[PDB]
Amino acid sequence: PQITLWKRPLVTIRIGGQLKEALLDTGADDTVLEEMNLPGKWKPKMIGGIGGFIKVRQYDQIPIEICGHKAIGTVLVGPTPVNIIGRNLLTQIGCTLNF
Amino acid sequence: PQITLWKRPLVTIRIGGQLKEALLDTGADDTVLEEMNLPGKWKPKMIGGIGGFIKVRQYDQIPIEICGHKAIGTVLVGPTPVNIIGRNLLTQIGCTLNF
């Protein structure tokens, strides 16, 4: 689809078998989801945002279906203000900015 | 133009007579610029992201050129690590997400 920006670009995603709402975030390098359980091994990591650094759990090679499009990649889980889809997965679904 | 998301979508902007690099950021409601001593009235604001909140100064009706496209609106100035063009200006320059 083409998505305009007068509203937040929120979309439904499917991950670990569950549906969630997430924000398409071109300013995020990484995909970061609010606290949730995911299967398999994870690694402790830290990432920084506008307000400082947080601790996250890094899960690699995780399938997510974003607005009907498949991605498989790194998902960070931790105290983000909102679920965000970052560039690591936006690239997989062929997302570009256009003006 | 079309901007892919393999790298950060940094573009050149001009504001208050300075040229800067800034993110075209669909995850940002508002535009947030690195500390700069702009003239005019402002209002204090707090904005939240990963890590917590920062304190910013809200300036209204500031002209800003983004990749050659003129815009005018609210800009928040404070200790962000990156200049961020948010949806309030992205809409003015006709920017969409496409996949």
Ligand SMILES: CCC(CC)CN(C[C@@H](O)[C@H](Cc1ccccc1)NC(=O)O[C@H]1CO[C@H]2OCC[C@H]21)S(=O)(=O)c1ccc2ncsc2c1
């Ligand atoms: C609430 C939704 C997100 C935070 C999740 C909002 N951010 C915009 C992001 O695009 C931000 C923009 C950003 C970019 C770089 C540094 C700081 C902020 N990116 C960001 O936090 O990305 C993190 C995940 O991937 C990593 O790559 C970049 C930082 C990490 S923000 O910068 O905090 C932000 C910007 C404008 C704004 N207007 C009103 S509240 C508000 C908050």
